[PDB]
Design a binder for this molecule. Sequence first.
Ligand SMILES: *[C@@H]1O[C@H](CO)[C@@H](O)[C@H](O)[C@H]1NC(C)=O
Ligand SMILES: *[C@@H]1O[C@H](CO)[C@@H](O)[C@H](O)[C@H]1NC(C)=O
Ligand SMILES: *[C@@H]1O[C@H](CO)[C@@H](O)[C@H](O)[C@H]1NC(C)=O
Ligand SMILES: *[C@@H]1O[C@H](CO)[C@@H](O)[C@H](O)[C@H]1NC(C)=O
Ligand SMILES: *[C@@H]1O[C@H](CO)[C@@H](O)[C@H](O)[C@H]1NC(C)=O
Ligand SMILES: [Cl-]
Lengths: 412, 138
Amino acid sequence: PSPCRNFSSVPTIYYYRIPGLYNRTALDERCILNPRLTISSTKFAYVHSEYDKNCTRGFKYYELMTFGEILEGPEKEPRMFSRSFYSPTNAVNYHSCTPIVTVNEGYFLCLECTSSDPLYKANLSNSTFHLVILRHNKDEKIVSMPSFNLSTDQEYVQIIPAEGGGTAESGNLYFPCIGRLLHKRVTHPLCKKSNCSRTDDESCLKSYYNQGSPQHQVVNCLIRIRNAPTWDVITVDLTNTYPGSRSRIFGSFSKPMLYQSSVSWHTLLQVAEITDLDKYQLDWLDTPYISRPGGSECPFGNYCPTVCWEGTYNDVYSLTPNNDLFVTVYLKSEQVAENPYFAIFSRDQILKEFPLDAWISSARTTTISCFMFNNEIWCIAALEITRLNDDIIRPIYYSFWLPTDCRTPYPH
Amino acid sequence: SIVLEPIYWNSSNSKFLPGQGLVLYPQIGDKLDIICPKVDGQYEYYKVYMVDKDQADRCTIKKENTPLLNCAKPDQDIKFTIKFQEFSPNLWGLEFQKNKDYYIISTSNGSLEGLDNQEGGVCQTRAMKILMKVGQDG
Ligand SMILES: *[C@@H]1O[C@H](CO)[C@@H](O)[C@H](O)[C@H]1NC(C)=O
Ligand SMILES: *[C@@H]1O[C@H](CO)[C@@H](O)[C@H](O)[C@H]1NC(C)=O
Ligand SMILES: *[C@@H]1O[C@H](CO)[C@@H](O)[C@H](O)[C@H]1NC(C)=O
Ligand SMILES: *[C@@H]1O[C@H](CO)[C@@H](O)[C@H](O)[C@H]1NC(C)=O
Ligand SMILES: *[C@@H]1O[C@H](CO)[C@@H](O)[C@H](O)[C@H]1NC(C)=O
Ligand SMILES: [Cl-]
């Protein structure tokens, strides 16, 4: 059935908080960060990072990966259930695990590196990719690739997985990556067509460098793996991109899509149809006024070129084959990581939005996936939050029921 | 939302004390703006950075840093909002935890030509530094 686009007779969207995947004694003494989730139909692949109370300045217990199922909860809402969780030992050396889900396998592309800042403090010579493969009632498998051995279409200093998620198509896995180019191959970057200043083009080019990489351009790429085997890096179209950042390659009714977090002057929502996956070519979509909190230079809704490197990741999901109706959980704030809103929107207008629970003290990374469940349209979002003024740091999860009948949205 | 009185980042701000700069004890969850105000003397040019203790003590910055504020627009107010908590949009480790100390300085000298100066500047000549003793009891 077709999703409703008109919410005049839909004062409330029905949504339900669903439990996390495990509970433990003294879970409040753990700092759980960086939720990554991809759902396809009835299966999901999920990963998060578990630390002591000091978060990334303390010990990392787990890079915790799981392949699970969507099942009914007590109020007929879809819930995530998993029985088996997996982690490397010495979790601090495993970074940026990026999930793909299929009906029979959960896949995670991780980077092993001794540095805490692998993109900027390590290179191909001292990094190794690991593809973790999870299956129901079977042993985990790990397939590895020293970074030096990866076939690349451009020369890179370093490449890391881009975290938000990937997709399986044409018998291959496609994971987003971020790389630092050896040479200055971005020469005519995408910039604002109607310039705000005489130096916009300069700003647009300079935006590809940052404090971590002052001399090498930071760009989006993808890692394609076949027979998960052969591994290839494909660089994004360098005339049609934005500075490399945490991203997700996702499916919209079997066609590939990109969400790219906005770290640059271009603070507005960055979502594209991927028009040729094996050449990583894009058609960027129009959006309404949906952005992310930033800093003083590139706060929410900045649209003129300048040089900055800031922002949160808050991804989207399409409810239609035509990619004209989307959901997100975005942060309605100029500069602070707080105030998450669920929003339903077309390319032109925010159609309905509302704040989530008032007891959320802060929120940073958010991710959302939608699926058919009991012949109904549902979305699950994972929010990286804190509660009780940073006393309790771990993600929460919501299930949203999206109506198909604009007159009578919710039966019974 | 608890909003602490904003810090105006300019040379006439008497809250920057000799030998000590500006010391405060923000609690987790508090909000505080640092503001470079527009023109009504002349506009004062600054890049304002978060730094470690050593750098604040020596009024010295290294290239591997990104301004919290780039005060280089005479025609408009520029505001940076801090919420004292773990999470923010900053991608270079801005993060606040209880019982830890944090530092903000500028080594700019106030003129356009001294904007990118790495040593001294108003941190030294005006004690324009902020010490934030987060989650602490003074
Ligand atoms: C949405 O539905 C309401 C109630 O039927 C109606 O007033 C409005 O014109 C509709 N908007 C459209 C079709 O754009
Ligand atoms: C976290 O850091 C604090 C202060 O730096 C320290 O006292 C404490 O031991 C750390 N927490 C642990 C090891 O759980
Ligand atoms: C990786 O190698 C580079 C030089 O080739 C070195 O500077 C860097 O520190 C190394 N990183 C790690 C994590 O070993
Ligand atoms: C756009 O750039 C052109 C070429 O430098 C310049 O002539 C024009 O004034 C600029 N427009 C602005 C700043 O609005
Ligand atoms: C600021 O520093 C610049 C560069 O060293 C210098 O040219 C300028 O005169 C200085 N201005 C002062 C101290 O007012
Ligand atoms: Cl570099």
